[PDB]
Amino acid sequence: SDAEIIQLVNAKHIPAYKLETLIETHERGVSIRRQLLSKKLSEPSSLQYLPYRDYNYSLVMGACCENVIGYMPIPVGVAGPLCLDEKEFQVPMATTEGCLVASTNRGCRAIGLGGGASSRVLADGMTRGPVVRLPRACDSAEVKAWLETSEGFAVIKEAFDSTSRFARLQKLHTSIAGRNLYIRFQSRSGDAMGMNMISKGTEKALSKLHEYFPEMQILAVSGNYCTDKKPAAINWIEGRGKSVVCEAVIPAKVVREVLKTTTEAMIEVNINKNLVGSAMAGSIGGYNAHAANIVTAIYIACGQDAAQNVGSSNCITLMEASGPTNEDLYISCTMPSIEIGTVGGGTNLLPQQACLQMLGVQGACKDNPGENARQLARIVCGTVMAGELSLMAALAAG
Amino acid sequence: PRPNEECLQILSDAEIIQLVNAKHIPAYKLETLIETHERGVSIRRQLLSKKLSEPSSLQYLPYRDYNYSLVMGACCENVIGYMPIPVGVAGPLCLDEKEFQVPMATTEGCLVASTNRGCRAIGLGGGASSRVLADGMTRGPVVRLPRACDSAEVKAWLETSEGFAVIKEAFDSTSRFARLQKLHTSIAGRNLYIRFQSRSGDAMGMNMISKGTEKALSKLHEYFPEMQILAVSGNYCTDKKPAAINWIEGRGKSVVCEAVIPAKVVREVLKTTTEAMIEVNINKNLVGSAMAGSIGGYNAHAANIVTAIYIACGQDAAQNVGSSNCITLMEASGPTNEDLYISCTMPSIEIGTVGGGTNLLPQQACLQMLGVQGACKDNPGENARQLARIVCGTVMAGELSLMAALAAGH
Amino acid sequence: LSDAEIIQLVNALETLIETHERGVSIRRQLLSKKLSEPSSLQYLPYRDYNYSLVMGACCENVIGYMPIPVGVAGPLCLDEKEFQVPMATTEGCLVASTNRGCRAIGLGGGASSRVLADGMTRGPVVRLPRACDSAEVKAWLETSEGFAVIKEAFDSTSRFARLQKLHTSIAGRNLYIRFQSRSGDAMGMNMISKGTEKALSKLHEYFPEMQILAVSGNYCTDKKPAAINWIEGRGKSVVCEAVIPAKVVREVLKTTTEAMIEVNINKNLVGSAMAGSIGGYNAHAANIVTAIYIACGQDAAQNVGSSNCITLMEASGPTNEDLYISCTMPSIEIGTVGGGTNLLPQQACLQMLGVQGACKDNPGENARQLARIVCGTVMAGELSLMAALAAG
Amino acid sequence: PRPNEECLQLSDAEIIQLVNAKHIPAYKLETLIETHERGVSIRRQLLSKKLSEPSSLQYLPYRDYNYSLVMGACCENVIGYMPIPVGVAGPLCLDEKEFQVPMATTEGCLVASTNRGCRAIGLGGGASSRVLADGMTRGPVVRLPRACDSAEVKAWLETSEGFAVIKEAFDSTSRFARLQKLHTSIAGRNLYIRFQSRSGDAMGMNMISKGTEKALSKLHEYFPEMQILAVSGNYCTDKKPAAINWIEGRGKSVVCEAVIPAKVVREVLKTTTEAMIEVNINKNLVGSAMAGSIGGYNAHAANIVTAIYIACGQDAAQNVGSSNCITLMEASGPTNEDLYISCTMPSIEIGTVGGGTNLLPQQACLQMLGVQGACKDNPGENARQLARIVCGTVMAGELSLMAALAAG
Ligand SMILES: COCc1c(C(C)C)nc(C(C)C)c(CC[C@@H](O)C[C@@H](O)CC(=O)O)c1-c1ccc(F)cc1
Numbered sequence A: 001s002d003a004e005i006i007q008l009v010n011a012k013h014i015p016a017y018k019l020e021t022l023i024e025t026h027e028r029g030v031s032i033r034r035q036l037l038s039k040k041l042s043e044p045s046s047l048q049y050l051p052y053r054d055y056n057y058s059l060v061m062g063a064c065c066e067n068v069i070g071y072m073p074i075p076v077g078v079a080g081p082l083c084l085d086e087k088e089f090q091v092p093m094a095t096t097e098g099c100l101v102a103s104t105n106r107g108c109r110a111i112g113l114g115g116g117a118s119s120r121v122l123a124d125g126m127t128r129g130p131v132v133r134l135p136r137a138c139d140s141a142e143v144k145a146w147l148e149t150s151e152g153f154a155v156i157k158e159a160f161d162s163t164s165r166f167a168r169l170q171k172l173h174t175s176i177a178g179r180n181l182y183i184r185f186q187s188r189s190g191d192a193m194g195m196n197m198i199s200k201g202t203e204k205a206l207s208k209l210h211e212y213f214p215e216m217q218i219l220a221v222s223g224n225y226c227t228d229k230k231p232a233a234i235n236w237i238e239g240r241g242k243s244v245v246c247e248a249v250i251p252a253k254v255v256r257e258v259l260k261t262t263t264e265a266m267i268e269v270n271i272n273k274n275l276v277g278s279a280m281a282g283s284i285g286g287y288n289a290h291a292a293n294i295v296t297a298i299y300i301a302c303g304q305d306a307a308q309n310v311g312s313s314n315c316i317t318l319m320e321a322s323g324p325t326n327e328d329l330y331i332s333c334t335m336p337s338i339e340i341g342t343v344g345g346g347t348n349l350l351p352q353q354a355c356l357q358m359l360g361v362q363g364a365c366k367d368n369p370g371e372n373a374r375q376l377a378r379i380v381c382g383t384v385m386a387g388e389l390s391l392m393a394a395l396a397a398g
Numbered sequence B: 001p002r003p004n005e006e007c008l009q010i011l012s013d014a015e016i017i018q019l020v021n022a023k024h025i026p027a028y029k030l031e032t033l034i035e036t037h038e039r040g041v042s043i044r045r046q047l048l049s050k051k052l053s054e055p056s057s058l059q060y061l062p063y064r065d066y067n068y069s070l071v072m073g074a075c076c077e078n079v080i081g082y083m084p085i086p087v088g089v090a091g092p093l094c095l096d097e098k099e100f101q102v103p104m105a106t107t108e109g110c111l112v113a114s115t116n117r118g119c120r121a122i123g124l125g126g127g128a129s130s131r132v133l134a135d136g137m138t139r140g141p142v143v144r145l146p147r148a149c150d151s152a153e154v155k156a157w158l159e160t161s162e163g164f165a166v167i168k169e170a171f172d173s174t175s176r177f178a179r180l181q182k183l184h185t186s187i188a189g190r191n192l193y194i195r196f197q198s199r200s201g202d203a204m205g206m207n208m209i210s211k212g213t214e215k216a217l218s219k220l221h222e223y224f225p226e227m228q229i230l231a232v233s234g235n236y237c238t239d240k241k242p243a244a245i246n247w248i249e250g251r252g253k254s255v256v257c258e259a260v261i262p263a264k265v266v267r268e269v270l271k272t273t274t275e276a277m278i279e280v281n282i283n284k285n286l287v288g289s290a291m292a293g294s295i296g297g298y299n300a301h302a303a304n305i306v307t308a309i310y311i312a313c314g315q316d317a318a319q320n321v322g323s324s325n326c327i328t329l330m331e332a333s334g335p336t337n338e339d340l341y342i343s344c345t346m347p348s349i350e351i352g353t354v355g356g357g358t359n360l361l362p363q364q365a366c367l368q369m370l371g372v373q374g375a376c377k378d379n380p381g382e383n384a385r386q387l388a389r390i391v392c393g394t395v396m397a398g399e400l401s402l403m404a405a406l407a408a409g410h
Numbered sequence C: 001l002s003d004a005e006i007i008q009l010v011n012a013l014e015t016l017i018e019t020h021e022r023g024v025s026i027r028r029q030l031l032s033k034k035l036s037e038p039s040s041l042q043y044l045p046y047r048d049y050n051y052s053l054v055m056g057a058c059c060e061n062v063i064g065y066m067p068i069p070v071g072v073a074g075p076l077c078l079d080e081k082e083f084q085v086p087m088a089t090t091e092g093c094l095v096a097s098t099n100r101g102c103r104a105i106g107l108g109g110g111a112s113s114r115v116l117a118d119g120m121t122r123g124p125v126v127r128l129p130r131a132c133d134s135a136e137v138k139a140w141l142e143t144s145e146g147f148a149v150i151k152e153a154f155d156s157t158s159r160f161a162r163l164q165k166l167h168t169s170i171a172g173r174n175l176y177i178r179f180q181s182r183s184g185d186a187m188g189m190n191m192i193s194k195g196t197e198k199a200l201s202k203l204h205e206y207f208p209e210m211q212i213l214a215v216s217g218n219y220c221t222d223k224k225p226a227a228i229n230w231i232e233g234r235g236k237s238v239v240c241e242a243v244i245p246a247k248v249v250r251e252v253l254k255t256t257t258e259a260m261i262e263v264n265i266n267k268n269l270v271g272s273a274m275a276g277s278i279g280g281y282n283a284h285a286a287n288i289v290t291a292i293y294i295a296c297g298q299d300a301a302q303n304v305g306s307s308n309c310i311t312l313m314e315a316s317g318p319t320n321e322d323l324y325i326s327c328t329m330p331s332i333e334i335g336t337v338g339g340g341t342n343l344l345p346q347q348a349c350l351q352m353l354g355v356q357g358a359c360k361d362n363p364g365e366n367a368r369q370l371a372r373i374v375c376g377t378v379m380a381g382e383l384s385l386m387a388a389l390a391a392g
Numbered sequence D: 001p002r003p004n005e006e007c008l009q010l011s012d013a014e015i016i017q018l019v020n021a022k023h024i025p026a027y028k029l030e031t032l033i034e035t036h037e038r039g040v041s042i043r044r045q046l047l048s049k050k051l052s053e054p055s056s057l058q059y060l061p062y063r064d065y066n067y068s069l070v071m072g073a074c075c076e077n078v079i080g081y082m083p084i085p086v087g088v089a090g091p092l093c094l095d096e097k098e099f100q101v102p103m104a105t106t107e108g109c110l111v112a113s114t115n116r117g118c119r120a121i122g123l124g125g126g127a128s129s130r131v132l133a134d135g136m137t138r139g140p141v142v143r144l145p146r147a148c149d150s151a152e153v154k155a156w157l158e159t160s161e162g163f164a165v166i167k168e169a170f171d172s173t174s175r176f177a178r179l180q181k182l183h184t185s186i187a188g189r190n191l192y193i194r195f196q197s198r199s200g201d202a203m204g205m206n207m208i209s210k211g212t213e214k215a216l217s218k219l220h221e222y223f224p225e226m227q228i229l230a231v232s233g234n235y236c237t238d239k240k241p242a243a244i245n246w247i248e249g250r251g252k253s254v255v256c257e258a259v260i261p262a263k264v265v266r267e268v269l270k271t272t273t274e275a276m277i278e279v280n281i282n283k284n285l286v287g288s289a290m291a292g293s294i295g296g297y298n299a300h301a302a303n304i305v306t307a308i309y310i311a312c313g314q315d316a317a318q319n320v321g322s323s324n325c326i327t328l329m330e331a332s333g334p335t336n337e338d339l340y341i342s343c344t345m346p347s348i349e350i351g352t353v354g355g356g357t358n359l360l361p362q363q364a365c366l367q368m369l370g371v372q373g374a375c376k377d378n379p380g381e382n383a384r385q386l387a388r389i390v391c392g393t394v395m396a397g398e399l400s401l402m403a404a405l406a407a408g
């Protein structure tokens, strides 16, 4: 019984996190971990409203989380339809910020009444940037030159690509800092965000490189040159994951009636807030109003890694006068580094798979690998554009 | 399935759907038409379900038994259910002579485990110490004057003791927690960006600062009638976008944390040496981030910890953008210089224990678990400050663990 | 003694020898023997130059001087005055294009400028045993009493040294302190350093465990790009503006207001954004800043931060066909006394502008006037080059 | 003083009379007169009357200078020249050679401190350097009607075929115009294209601008709807701080290194290896990080770059990006008491042919280094050698100044 397992565990031997190994059932393991934790709290009843029952923990234990004590429910709203590339999407948004889903929905409506939005994927490739060290800068220079010859690259590419069917080493960007050499490996990864896959490829590639340069020390599989989950100019300038651009034209009438403002007022706010304002703040990649809000809500709803909102949110929002009389609104959003996937990680869980299915991009695209992930990136870029339209109209109106 | 003329009373499921499609009523008004909250949701799902390519795609999206009462008109719209995020626990975290059991909402494997290991190394080292260096949420509107000479005049005016006092009075009249601290202004030709900074009790303070800013700008307008208020936010805050200003001047809570890990613990718990950790920290977190052209990203993975705690505690997760700013430093310490000194400095943790998502019960549970839920009666803001310290300490545990693993390499 | 005699004595200068010009001749001969082209030095000038002002103040191991052509652009109609701007450069068409920009402004009724802030900085890095201690020092530095004592100590070092504010930043047990102060008409580097050393010494008396790691911890920030100079300013922060009549844009600049605006937005704002620029939202401020700095005896290496600029353009007037233009430069590091401004030729260029030496009546006014002149000339430079790009 | 309508054959005051009468612009004095120095003397006299103190130009030299090289090439409305003291630091032991480095500056102790740095390196066995990349850039901004079109152009430019045709049109403009990679970036319907190419021993601006013009003209044939907004869209990026130059390089990317024996650090630099390291990490790495620097992880590279640039006829305004540098220091040797130091400079914009290097005095400083003009047999080698020299001198400068800060 629980009372029995509790005193057996209190007898040090087994730690609270070794409950999924002993106890013959997931949910009970959680209940037992909770009771044990409750007694260590200044308020033993604090867990009362934290849910944990009837959740499919089979897919979570040993793949997505440890020392599980329940789950956190995030309200999921829906914005749409989003008319993108001649299709209609109903976008799931997990958030606790009031008016976010509503304002984004309004943005979607303005786009719909404007004939829809168009998007293009400009680049696709997840990255990993390890740091290695040579005895001297002259040696690291030699390695860089070697990696730059067609023969050196081919050897590394072969080693990298042997690790998986989706591992296709695209290019290599190397940077030297004295005797240190940072190597940025880039590769597609089917419909997976590709972090783990690229890591495996990187470890195999660095090993092959160690044979030709035995004096090379592999300091860290990640030397922050990726760059993963930290702001960096490199992701903005060279891209990371999926680089996407979206656009739409909003008829003056729609700007007037749906957005409650004018094209001229929107343009003036965009230039002075999103361009000049971000410039005065010393921003690198943050030339937008609130891309992070949309990226985050969709990421949580679709099982993405929410911490990747850091670089995935990079965006430059542009607005221009358009049309016969210059009263129509041209708008574009360019996002160079959307880190996303429809396979693996949190996308392996059922509730998040439901939101992905809702968009028609769940799991692998069997006939065209990577297409589901690309479609999801396009959807994110389009929804961000709807979000930018709506919030900017509100700011422009006062 | 009764006809529409009869259905105008106060009925059946298929009938509401037929009344919705017929009288063209937007799905978002379902909360004001049906009896429960859960049924408004169920109908919305049913309406939504026909507009899909896979009508059964919502099958596993939970929606039943959720307390929508607190969500409606406050946290979300067009609700079709909720998304469960697994919550793990890392700890105890020995911080400032207390012990914390940190809730972490995540779907990334080994994150909670590695962070837990980091907590253990710290506990064995005698614990961590933290300090709140600054506290003040900001809002940075952009106004325009006819000429740069006029915007310069406004800037100078805002810089006199009398001008500031007038603005501070106007700003502070809007709320009991609104305490205008300072003003940072920047000019770009005829544009003037004004960064208002103020404490806000235990609330993250976005809404309170906006109200204060609107009252202050209105007052400023009385002194300079030719001033045009272009946007209540001119990106000079800066909210949810990377910016050097948050890194250099801070935003929300600026915090520093530190600990010393005995060589023995580095060896046995972290599976490496102090010397290897230091070498990885310098060449990855300092030199690597420098080569990548990073502003404020001199850390290994602060964003992972900040995000997991933010989701579990009802914070605004989109604020992970600036809240994640962190510089992690490591150095040789002790008699033989073999013990590991580690510090994490986070200038812009945007956080709160009142309002927004913290008004929901499940997230209040995670906040209670930390002992920082809601307002602090006897010392306003203390709960939010305590939460920021906890976030900074957990990030440091996360940095310790991940760096040890990278240092041990293979 | 001959020259080959003194040379032989050195093997087996201005201190030993009597003449200044002779000591240079000797050094040139001594150095001549180590080069693989000893004749190369024949075209490097050295005679008829008074090394008196240079020795022990501006340069060492002097082997001559480098002549930089000085051109003149103007008149520059700024704040109801007219300036003839000296520009030392070797880049063809720079002076000419800048002159054209000046003409467009003159025809537009002139330019207006304002100095928004004035204060040179020095940002030393100190260390405490623990982050908790550095936090304590920061808190103390932010109290009115703590600032008062540091200020008293800083200001006691010179008549001009006046401490304005303190910006402190923590990195674990490290504490970076940015001292900002006016400095009369001097660029103020040396003066601020003296003040900083006296202030840190005083701070040490309150916190004996504090280690002064370096008088400069790169938090100033001097001669390296940094967001801190852009956001908080350094030296003189200046804004300049003008309106160019549609006719002038058409006839002098050979383009239209609409084309200029479109180039400014997509080049200076969007382009600089795509490039990941911090403070480089302009076309070529560095060209003007550098040419004037060399001609006026400023420290040319300071072109790094001094060049920070955001150039803005918009439609103005009744029919919205006139060109409104502004340039905002947050960190112009400049001076009219000390350093290279102590030399006669550079003093001539400063006199040409009417800002040489100290402004006895109001210290700092000459330096402020020079900063305004630099900002206005940059604006003329931006107008001209942008017109050329908008046209083709 | 003869009458105006007589003089067309005359004195100084006669030229003045004519100019002030017909409102003939001062820059015309070059074509108007027959000589050069007299055109300068007349411009000064004319200018002197437009000054609040007509005696201003008294100490600004103009006599005995070679204006033939300047006129129509380096400067306009010339009123004289500005003398910048030139000091010498060295020998600089770099790659088994010895260099005597010319430095034009007015900052006291700069040459001296740099000289000390050179001595510490010499006594340490010298420094080694490598050129990692070479390629000047120009980054124009073009516009298409829609983002979908600009994306099509980007994709087209990325094919081996599309590139070849671009490389052709670009290369056909010069002997040295040899186009390497293309880096494109999209911002909605805007497309920024960064052309990168070697340029022999020339810094490369004009050369690459020409290639870019012909490449864009070529691209306009495949895309008639493409509008060339500006030959430079700030994506180069030239003379403005930018992360792109730091990350992708511009001009010459160079790395330099040396090891300084503990004894030398102690006796010449007056400090210890341990103190130097501690200052480097907390000033050049952490300090620059706290300041929000992009590419400024050094103590004073700009000082050395500027002094050498002025002395060698380089474009001094290029000190903005050319100064980018990350200075690194670490414990080395058996006893781990020796000082390892490296400086990495990704974007040194330099040349030994063209611009100010066409003038004699600056050619003297270039000859002093043995890199003047074109390298007949190995094009670009002189410019590369100059970049290595700059990187090595910066390293000497960093060593010396850091030692002084460490000692206190
Ligand atoms: C006037 O309110 C505008 C508004 C709206 C409306 C569309 C309902 N929605 C949101 C939300 C519901 C989308 C936010 C606030 C958005 C916030 O998350 C991000 C924002 O702070 C980023 C920035 O612009 O700097 C703001 C809003 C934005 C900035 C303000 F100062 C005040 C209010």
Ligand SMILES: COCc1c(C(C)C)nc(C(C)C)c(CC[C@@H](O)C[C@@H](O)CC(=O)O)c1-c1ccc(F)cc1
Pocket: A128, A199, A221, A222, A223, A224, A226, A227, A228, A229, B108, B109, B110, B111, B114, B300, B301, B304, B401, B402, B405, B406, B409
């Ligand atoms: C070798 O594995 C190290 C490791 C561990 C271990 C402590 C379990 N946990 C995580 C996780 C579970 C904490 C991550 C990966 C962490 C990832 O989210 C952020 C990381 O990418 C940040 C960065 O350093 O750039 C990595 C890991 C880090 C860098 C790699 F290249 C590969 C794997």
Ligand SMILES: COCc1c(C(C)C)nc(C(C)C)c(CC[C@@H](O)C[C@@H](O)CC(=O)O)c1-c1ccc(F)cc1
Pocket: C091, C092, C093, C094, C097, C283, C284, C287, C384, C385, C388, C389, C392, D138, D209, D231, D232, D233, D234, D236, D237, D238, D239
């Ligand atoms: C078509 O020529 C434009 C022109 C002019 C004209 C005003 C004579 N002058 C200069 C000079 C004489 C001012 C430069 C070249 C200016 C150069 O120094 C800086 C510039 O490169 C900064 C930038 O805009 O990125 C350029 C020019 C600028 C960019 C080109 F691509 C080509 C030519």
Ligand SMILES: COCc1c(C(C)C)nc(C(C)C)c(CC[C@@H](O)C[C@@H](O)CC(=O)O)c1-c1ccc(F)cc1
Pocket: C122, C193, C215, C216, C217, C218, C220, C221, C222, C223, D107, D108, D109, D110, D113, D299, D300, D303, D400, D401, D404, D405, D408
């Ligand atoms: C204590 O003097 C150190 C010293 C020396 C010595 C080699 C004589 N030379 C120079 C000169 C002569 C090389 C400078 C001053 C150097 C200055 O130009 C750049 C410097 O400011 C960059 C930085 O370190 O942030 C400084 C110096 C540097 C920083 C100070 F705070 C004070 C003095």
Ligand SMILES: Nc1ncnc2c1ncn2[C@@H]1O[C@H](COP(=O)(O)OP(=O)(O)O)[C@@H](O)[C@H]1O
Pocket: A101, A102, A103, A105, A106, A107, A109, A258, B028, B077, B078
């Ligand atoms: N509660 C809500 N849920 C979803 N969308 C909403 C909500 N409120 C407003 N919207 C969006 O905002 C737009 C504006 O609606 P509203 O404020 O009622 O003004 P109007 O009647 O003038 O359109 C709607 O078309 C809808 O897309």
Ligand SMILES: Nc1ncnc2c1ncn2[C@@H]1O[C@H](COP(=O)(O)OP(=O)(O)O)[C@@H](O)[C@H]1O
Pocket: A164, A166, A189, A190, A191, A192, A193, A194, A195, A196, A197, A341, A343, A344, A345, A363, A364, A365, A369, A370
């Ligand atoms: N079409 C596909 N795209 C991507 N991954 C696929 C596909 N089909 C199968 N897979 C499998 O899924 C893995 C990616 O998921 P995972 O290992 O969780 O890593 P990550 O979440 O870091 O991308 C691949 O290594 C491969 O085994």
Ligand SMILES: Nc1ncnc2c1ncn2[C@@H]1O[C@H](COP(=O)(O)OP(=O)(O)O)[C@@H](O)[C@H]1O
Pocket: A017, A066, A067, B112, B113, B114, B116, B117, B118, B120, B268, B269
């Ligand atoms: N599943 C897990 N959940 C939580 N913490 C974990 C988990 N696995 C490991 N840890 C952390 O990692 C530390 C290392 O334990 P383990 O991997 O068994 O190695 P060792 O037995 O060599 O110490 C533990 O003290 C704990 O803090």
Ligand SMILES: Nc1ncnc2c1ncn2[C@@H]1O[C@H](COP(=O)(O)OP(=O)(O)O)[C@@H](O)[C@H]1O
Pocket: C095, C096, C097, C099, C100, C103, C252, D027, D076, D077
């Ligand atoms: N060599 C020069 N020196 C100084 N200013 C010049 C020079 N050439 C042109 N300018 C300036 O540029 C403007 C352009 O004149 P010019 O080159 O003759 O072309 P245009 O008359 O076709 O506009 C003039 O107003 C003048 O101020």
Ligand SMILES: Nc1ncnc2c1ncn2[C@@H]1O[C@H](COP(=O)(O)OP(=O)(O)O)[C@@H](O)[C@H]1O
Pocket: C158, C160, C183, C184, C185, C186, C187, C188, C189, C190, C191, C335, C337, C338, C339, C358, C359, C363, C364
């Ligand atoms: N009006 C003035 N403004 C500034 N400095 C002045 C003034 N009058 C005299 N001075 C002197 O000139 C010195 C400034 O020159 P210097 O020490 O070389 O420093 P800087 O680096 O600022 O040029 C001051 O210390 C002071 O003795």
Ligand SMILES: Nc1ncnc2c1ncn2[C@@H]1O[C@H](COP(=O)(O)OP(=O)(O)O)[C@@H](O)[C@H]1O
Pocket: D174, D176, D199, D200, D201, D202, D203, D204, D205, D206, D207, D351, D353, D354, D355, D374, D375, D379, D380
């Ligand atoms: N070896 C060489 N390398 C480069 N340029 C050379 C060489 N030999 C002759 N030249 C000529 O010198 C020019 C370089 O000077 P210039 O056109 O002013 O351009 P820049 O100074 O901007 O590099 C080249 O365009 C070419 O005509």
